[PDB]
Amino acid sequence: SFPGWGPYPPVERDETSAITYSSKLHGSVTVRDPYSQLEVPFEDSEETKAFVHSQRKFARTYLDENPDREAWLETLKKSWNYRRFSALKPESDGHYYFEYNDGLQSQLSLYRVRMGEEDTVLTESGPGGELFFNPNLLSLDGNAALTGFVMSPCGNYWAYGVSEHGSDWMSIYVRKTSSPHLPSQERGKDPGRMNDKIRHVRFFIVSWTSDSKGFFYSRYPPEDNAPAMNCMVYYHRIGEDQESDVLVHEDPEHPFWISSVQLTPSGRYILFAASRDASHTQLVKIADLHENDIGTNMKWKNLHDPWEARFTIVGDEGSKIYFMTNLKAKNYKVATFDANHPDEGLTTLIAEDPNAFLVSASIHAQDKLLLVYLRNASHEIHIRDLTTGKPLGRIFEDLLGQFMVSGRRQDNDIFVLFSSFLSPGTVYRYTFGEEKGYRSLFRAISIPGLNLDDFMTESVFYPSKDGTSVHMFITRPKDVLLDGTSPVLQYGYGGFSLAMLPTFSLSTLLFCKIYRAIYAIPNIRGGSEYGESWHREGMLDKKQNVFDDFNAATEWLIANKYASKDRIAIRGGANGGVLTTACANQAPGLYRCVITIEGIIDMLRFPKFTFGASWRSEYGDPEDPEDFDFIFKYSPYHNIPPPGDTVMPAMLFFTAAYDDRVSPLHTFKHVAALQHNFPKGPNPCLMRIDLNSGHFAGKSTQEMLEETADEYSFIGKSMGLTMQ
Ligand code: NA
């Protein structure tokens, strides 16, 4: 039987294309890749162009034929038109800065208010204060993004990154803090900036010297799919051209290594850190900027033996530097180094918590050390004495979710942004005291037409295949019955010590309301939810544990009558695309709809493209014979089930035509192979393409809504759901 939506657009095959891999078990294994031509970028291949255009047109026709697509876009537009803001961030110009969106602006704007006048911002009258920077003015389409910013210590200068209009490359710009954007400036330019333009940057790590004369940054050779190579550290002096910038570090022997510098808050010490993979291990060196001219002739001293640990600067006290480090402490700890006694090594200030991952450490009110711990898949705030490390107790103990803390060592107050599945964003002020402090509600995000009291988030524990107890969040309307009829949207990642925290998404709650559905977040292995050991149990030869955890979550939801066996939708992005494609291959019968965002799918070829080589610490090295065998077992691109005795779920793949973070070739080849293997469906396999590269880290509000309307209408069609 031939479905009315077919046939699929044709995709050229290369029947001769193969690579031979060393294998511990088999000696050698020859892997055919009939779609290897789709590894050539869109801009360089007419074949890749023809594939993208035909697949894009085919997907759009199917998605747009569904009237629920426009119904979802209208519902999303109306509900997403709510005011959003960050916590107040104190800066060296004596102003608080905050992110603001009226509702449907493409990008967040940056506003400011004099410290002491903050009670006049974020009222019914509007954001108040003064507009500082409006990213919406940068591009005609609103796809140009602020990638970061750092104010000069003097408070006169503001260094900031803007993503270039084709790519995930950026330029660093500088403007005076006396040159804000004006509300009536025209789109397509950046008015009021200084002449400085730092090109060839792929990540924003900028550190000003204490004299405010310049900043350190990391850059690459000029850009005229290939692995990212030859990261260099430079120093830029304000008012000079980039051509005058002084080279601080290059390592031509190790072109895949990523390098950056961080300065202590005093600006006295510079920490050089190199990374050779995605693991939390560095090659680290410290220099005293008072001993050295900026250049390649600086007196670098070894902080510790290379590749054993990561070191993040938390503060300084003369020659004493405070570090958050995992040195002999996989869950991280706080330790001090005396730059005057390097050979004495690191002294523990806050011991590793064996049962809690330390996320951050920051100094406040001169000598209060604030620790954010991850315990039971949510944030805890602990206060410690900076001098002794002695515990001073807990704050916000009653709030279960995630926190963003803003405030400096010199401020007695912090602003804390609290959020969860059910809390869109409450900014609390906390004022430090002698024995206890005082907490005040500053401002709360409210969403018109959403009643947060209509929803709940349950915490359950389920056994995985191997008997391991896994935590899962289940968000649902309180009035949805547990009678085994509800649809599920189940989101997972599983990797890189990244926790799936309670996180606010209006879209997800609208999915729950409109489809009487549950939103399930199983805290599967690979994440840091139960400490670094939770990551170690879900990587390399144990990556299969991640898929088993996710499958067992679905089986538990069905068995305990949370969900209909026929209405499971799964969702994942990047490393989460390994999860969605692997689970679809290994248990196609569990799932009715699979959403993959910028998926990693070819687990043999991933090292050959942009930043993929760094993922070898997580997945293994496919060119190592031992690693090949365990990677090849699950590599979703190489394990599409034979068509004869499998019905594939409906599958929708989101990707840009250009993406540095995950090369779109992963999606291109897997979509080609799925369509070839299952040419008659019965369930469609579609690729939803953005041609504007709408950056992950810089996506306009309107693009996000269109993508969500495509995703939800496709899930609705695929699982036979009616919008309520
Ligand atoms: Na823009």
Author numbering: 2 to 225, 231 to 730
What text comes from the article?
OphP is an essential enzyme for the biosynthesis of the macrocyclic peptide natural product omphalotin A. The enzyme has been proposed to proteolytically release a peptide intermediate from the precursor protein OphMA and to macrocyclize the multiply α-N-methylated core of this intermediate to produce omphalotin A. Our *in vitro* experiments demonstrate that OphP does not process OphMA but shows robust macrocyclase activity on pre-processed α-N-methylated peptides. OphP tolerates sequence promiscuity in the substrate but has a preference for highly α-N-methylated substrates and for N-methylated glycine residue at the catalytic site. The promiscuity of OphP is explained by structural analysis of co-complexes which reveals a predominantly hydrophobic substrate binding cleft with few interactions between substrate side chains and OphP. Similar to other POPs, the monomer has two domains, an α/β hydrolase domain (residues 1–82, 453–738) and the seven-bladed β-propeller domain (residues 83–452) ([Fig fig4]).
We first determined the structure of the putatively catalytically inactive OphP variant S580A. The eight monomers differ only in flexible loops some of which are involved in crystal contacts. All the monomers in the asymmetric unit adopt a “closed” conformation with the two domains packed against each other. Structure alignment between OphP and GmPOPB confirmed the putative catalytic triad with some deviations regarding the position of its histidine residue ([Fig fig4]). His701 of OphP sits in a flexible loop region (Leu697–Thr707) which is only resolved in two chains (chain A and chain H) where it adopts different conformations (**Figure S11**). Although chain A and H have different arrangements of this loop, in both His701 is around 15 Å away from Ser580 and a structural re-arrangement is required to form the canonical catalytic triad. Apo S580A crystallized in a closed conformation in the absence of ligand ([Fig fig4]).
